[PDB]
Amino acid sequence: TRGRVIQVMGPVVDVKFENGHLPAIYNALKIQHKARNENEVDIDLTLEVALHLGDDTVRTIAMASTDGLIRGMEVIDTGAPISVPVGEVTLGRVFNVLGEPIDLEGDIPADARRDPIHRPAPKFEELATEVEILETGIKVVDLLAPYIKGGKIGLFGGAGVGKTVLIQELIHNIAQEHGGISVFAGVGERTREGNDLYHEMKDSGVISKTAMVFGQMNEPPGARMRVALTGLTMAEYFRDEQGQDVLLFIDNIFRFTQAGSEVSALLGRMPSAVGYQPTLATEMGQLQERITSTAKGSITSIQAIYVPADDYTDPAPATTFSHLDATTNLERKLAEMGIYPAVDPLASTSRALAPEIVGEEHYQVARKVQQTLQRYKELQDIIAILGMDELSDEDKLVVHRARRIQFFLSQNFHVAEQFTGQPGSYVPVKETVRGFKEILEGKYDHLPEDAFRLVGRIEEVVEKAKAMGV
Amino acid sequence: APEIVGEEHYQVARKVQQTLQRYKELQDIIAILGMDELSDEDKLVVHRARRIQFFLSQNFHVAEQFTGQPGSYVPVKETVRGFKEILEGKYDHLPEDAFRLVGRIEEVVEKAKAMGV
Amino acid sequence: SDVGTVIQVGDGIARAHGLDNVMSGELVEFANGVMGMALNLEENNVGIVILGPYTGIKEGDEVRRTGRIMEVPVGEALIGRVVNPLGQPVDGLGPVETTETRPIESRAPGVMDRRSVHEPLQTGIKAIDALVPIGRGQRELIIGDRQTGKTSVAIDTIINQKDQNMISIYVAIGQKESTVRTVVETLRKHGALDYTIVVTASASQPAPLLFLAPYAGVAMGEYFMYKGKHVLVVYDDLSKQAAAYRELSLLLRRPPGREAYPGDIFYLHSRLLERAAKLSDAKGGGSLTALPFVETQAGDISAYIPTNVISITDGQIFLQSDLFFSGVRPAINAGLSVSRVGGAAQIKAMKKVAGTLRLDLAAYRELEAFAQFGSDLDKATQAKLARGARTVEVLKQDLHQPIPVEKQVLIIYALTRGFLDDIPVEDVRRFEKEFYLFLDQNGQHLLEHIRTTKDLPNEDDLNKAIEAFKKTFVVS
Amino acid sequence: SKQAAAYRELSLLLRRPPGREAYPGDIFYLHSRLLERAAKLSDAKGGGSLTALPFVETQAGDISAYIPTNVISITDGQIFLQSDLFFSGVRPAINAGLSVSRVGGAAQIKAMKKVAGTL
Ligand SMILES: Nc1ncnc2c1ncn2[C@@H]1O[C@H](COP(=O)(O)OP(=O)(O)OP(=O)(O)O)[C@@H](O)[C@H]1O
Ligand SMILES: [Mg+2]
């Protein structure tokens, strides 16, 4: 049908279309306009309905600047929520929120598959019992804080301490050993990361599969809100239609609440909490709940998430933090030591396998590791105050082994091959546990500490020590 | 007021309040500077303040259900006499815990006897 | 007429024109097939709150009225299923086939309809059963921060309530569906599903279902209570229900108060919690026990919702964050956890022995701080500290393996008498299970006597059997 | 403070727009109208005087609240009373440091000035 514009209110837009047969909530309306005379300005705009009003008026939100909108101009309604283009054809390019590629390498054909963004979460019927652990191929992650597939992961790491290297390695491993593809959706600052990912993941070829979606701070509130949901619809296509054993990734959750900070400005309604929208928990939940495992296909939408807010008691970080499953921390002081990845023994949950299923050895090893690290920390405190030489023999042996344990944590990443020159190593979780057990058992107390660096397996440590000409 | 309650009662009440206020500031002083930098008289003030705030606890009737103690009804004269006795420091030897949840000062003495003091 | 046209739609609220005869609180079902609750009448336009998905609603739709107040179907058929807050199946397995319906706005049992609690509820956790007993009909508040093991405690209780007649209704509000499915599978594995009902509303659902969920759960429990069946209701979290009602209230343009919640929070929580009571002998002896949950940020009790709920509860269970992180499972603080009705429901033997343990735990807790200050200590304090360490060791439960009460009283008596002094701290854990097995295979008569009499048996032969186990046990 | 509460209640019932703490816009106008009549008439008029000692209540000694600020900016001095000195054993509990009076030198007898300066 066709309806005319009657009101404009800037960012909230509040275009009150007068129409014959109204479109449902979340439906898409597209405006086409031409410069009939010198005064008028041609504009092509898309809007999303958000609220019905008295008589025929339907409130909307515009995804771009409304400068040049004139009362009386005709509007056409598409018939369905804003349709992202998705499928094989769309793989391998960077999109805006609406669906056009920002880089002008190519244009998506009209014939392609287009799916609506807003979909109800998977029913309770299709869910699956979740006990299994996803393998990351990173020794520390597989030893201290494993990730439950289908669950949200948190990584509290400052920019420049290895965030980009860590996520590149994760997506490379998940595309090398698994059938999983990744999806990235940023909202903040500058995307210099585009060229780093271009280098490594285009050498790997995964760039052709990862369908990045970008809309950043310069965009109006509506696009900054709906970008994450476009990113999620990218994964939803794979899980529903493809149904491959693709345990895919999506790399942003909290950024939706960072955009929700601006969604509070998008509302234009009664304030609540600390200026936040009333529907904060519901609005975040609608996104978070679409990430699930399922029996329709072997697709776990497990996501690694960075939280820029980093304030505990604030309502939005608390509401987001309630949904998180596992947590990890990246700190600069550990980066100083040359131990990479710079992850510390902080962990969360991940007990679905160990010790729940059997997991006895894994759980006991992890507990001993954390205990030894904290004992080494207090011993290091004592050493500075008075001196190590006065420590007893049995207490000194703890530091002796702790040095090796601390240094073994480093892993020679595959992505680092283009800078360091190391080919890179992938480790199975069982191999990590089995190999590390001997370290706690003191099989290799005599070996020099420097051998325990940037190696995948314990035999590699032994051979490196040998190569040092012992 | 001194006329309503009697001179000795009013004086005991006000000395108790003064000592408790002095301790209320001494705790902050201790937190910032430590518990070792206090003066001898300050040590005495804290020493008696602890016992005074402890003795104010009373075993109750209805609390016999919640915890299983008999309970006591303390006359005013016993209260003022006991508070004067502790204020003058006649019970320097007794431990602090003996002043916890008792009706009469004789029960304090009995509790200290049970402690083996 | 009984048919009216909707004229507004937004975020779960709709107005309608017409509907002259509609009653306040009535259920109205739209032409889409979804139904809503008529909160407010007006001179010309009724205000309707929409329970289901509102996207399909349009201006010009015709809404009809069912003719009844808000009702939740109930019946024994529901036992062993998973249902929405509104009584519609969300798990396949065909329809519900319920017997009858009960409104959600029932009047609570008034004064002189109740009796003092006299029947215990065995959670199977040594710490909860021993130091902070809970009785049937006592509403016990469970407060703790996230990642502290609260749901472990609730599931352990529901699992342990196997022999005792206890229709246990479990409700999760706003929780993640994956956790709900994991919990349902966990209950099925242990065979606790045949006597339990799970009703849940997740975060994805509209707020009206989230705020309706716990009332529907307690209305489910009410039917079983009236016939005389004992009932247990567990709420996964009340704070998120408060947030959902905050959403609904402020979307209705009602001024907020302290913090951000409207003034109706106390009414909302108290009306829900008041329906759980121990009915008197004249009424039939039915009992409803509630175990609500609330989330405290950074473990601070001083806040609007936590204190508001504490004013209603008959007790509190405080789960310590850092104690949980240290490795103690589950986490509970001796100082802040108290039960008012405790001691009138706990069996005689537990009061005979366990009563000494709580004072020892608290005194050890404070002496622990002093000893942390003190490098050098006298022998009596050392003995007290060692006993405290042993008590802390004995109080650590195994997950999903509740222990019967008789074993609890035996092990706690064995600890309190002090035979464990020779046994090293680490050896105590293995000692407990070996002692359990030795009692089970050989020492039957003591267990039978405690099961029937409810009192400690002859001490001489009891100590003889304990000493025989001490003979068989080998120190590391 | 109760006068301010009564005026706030009677204003809010009238639907007059609120202000800093729901107080109407006329609070300072009203208190200045009240307090400005206190004066010391000249010798010509007759030499009368109308001195005032208004009281203000404050929670937890937060004398920086709206009404205390208004009254302290209208008055010619304040006497700050604190429960801390009150239970400290010094009564009446007057804070000498925070108390100021802007008639300090003129409203005293000469011997009182002479001794009180050194005090
Ligand atoms: N007593 C325990 N012993 C061992 N592991 C435990 C224990 N309690 C909890 N856990 C582990 O920690 C996890 C914590 O899950 P849980 O749901 O209890 O967390 P919570 O944040 O305290 O509660 P909720 O999710 O209800 O708010 C459990 O899934 C389990 O793996
Ligand atoms: Mg839980």
UniProtKB/TrEMBL annotation, chain B:
It is found in: Cell membrane. Produces ATP from ADP in the presence of a proton gradient across the membrane. The catalytic sites are hosted primarily by the beta subunits. Produces ATP from ADP in the presence of a sodium ion gradient across the membrane. The beta chain is the catalytic subunit. Belongs to the ATPase alpha/beta chains family. This is ATP synthase subunit beta. It comes from Bacillus sp. (strain PS3). The gene is uncD.
UniProtKB/TrEMBL annotation, chain C:
ATP 5 binds at residues 339-340. Residues 1-67 form the ATPase F1/V1/A1 complex alpha/beta subunit N-terminal domain. Residues 346-469 form the ATP synthase alpha subunit C-terminal domain. One of its GO terms (molecular function) is proton-transporting ATP synthase activity, rotational mechanism. Mg(2+) 1 binds at residue 151. Pfam families: ATP-synt_ab, ATP-synt_ab_C, ATP-synt_ab_N. Residues 124-339 form the ATPase F1/V1/A1 complex alpha/beta subunit nucleotide-binding domain. ATP 1 binds at residues 146-152, 175, 329, 397-398. It comes from the Bacteria. Signal peptide: none annotated. ATP 6 binds at residue 340. This is ATP synthase subunit alpha. It comes from Bacillus sp. (strain PS3). The gene is uncA.
